[PDB]
């Protein structure tokens, strides 16, 4: 059972950040750590280097990884750190954040606007931060979470029975991995 | 299996409640039992917080959320207080809960450098003058790793241990659950 949802905030053009990994089992695991693009696809040339990229983490052991940059300055960019283990898969958001950005995601959570078209509920995020939805309800039905990209949109597939629905509520996940306060709006017609 | 970073919950002292998600990573359903404990993971006579729902079903790979609401504990306004939320998954995990007065200026990383260190009685003793828990993520003394423990606010922590050694290096864990920059000092 996991509590909360960690994310890594990488200040844009920092030389690197350190990240702790822990083996929760009483057996050793070989872990491979790699940074992927926002869709967990391997990039042509990795935008980040992880050290050690591959090592043996013994039973109950904790170890630090170095993540080093190898980007727009008006908004965040999303990558993923994925740690894959086998005997000798956990993906976490790596939010590349320009120092130029003012404020934090919770200050912009209320600013999402919503439309319905083509059977989808579409969020618009005018802010420079990923609005990482952690709870989403439309017409009283839970909708699976997905981030709303900065200065962009995200369109959610809807379960049956929601034609005509108006009422959306949401919570973002804050930088600390917790769920923020609830906001409620009607869909713009 | 392999956890990345270390989540904590920041509870503003004046807040009615906070919310956190819980996920069942197994391919079978479990019943989630949640409770709040004191800083030593022991039950209090009257729980200073209430978690709802205290018991619920999470099916395979499903997630839901818990509400943690203060329930009458009187917390000081001059420093942080530490509690634990512990969750157990049962067929049909503990996280720090840091109570933070709105009166406090700054965040932990702004005071991480201010730890000072002494050695007495075979222990390495950290002094934390700040009003925040300094949650150690990495600690070395004389080049040897020392198991981490929080350094409580306006107080101290003594680590079991190197008689000649004077050089301490440390990283705290920031509010986001990540490792902060490295600091080095010699003991006083």
Swiss-Prot record, chain B:
GO terms for cellular component: outer membrane-bounded periplasmic space. Pfam families: PapD_C (PF02753), PapD_N (PF00345). The keyword Iron-sulfur does not apply. Its main location: periplasm. Keywords: Chaperone, Disulfide bond, Immunoglobulin domain, Periplasm, Plasmid, Signal. The keyword Chaperone applies. GO terms for molecular function: protein folding chaperone. InterPro entries: Ig-like_fold (IPR013783), PapD-like_sf (IPR008962), Periplasmic_pilus_chap (IPR050643), Pili_assmbl_chap_C_dom_sf (IPR036316), Pili_assmbl_chaperone_bac (IPR001829), Pili_assmbl_chaperone_C (IPR016148), Pili_assmbl_chaperone_CS (IPR018046), Pili_assmbl_chaperone_N (IPR016147). GO terms for biological process: cell wall organization; chaperone-mediated protein folding. Disulfide bonds join 86-94. It is found in: Periplasm. Belongs to the periplasmic pilus chaperone family. PANTHER family: CHAPERONE PROTEIN CAF1M, PILUS ASSEMBLY CHAPERONE. Has a stimulatory role for the envelope antigen F1 secretion. It seems to interact with the subunit polypeptide and to prevent it from digestion by a protease. This is Chaperone protein caf1M. It comes from Yersinia pestis.
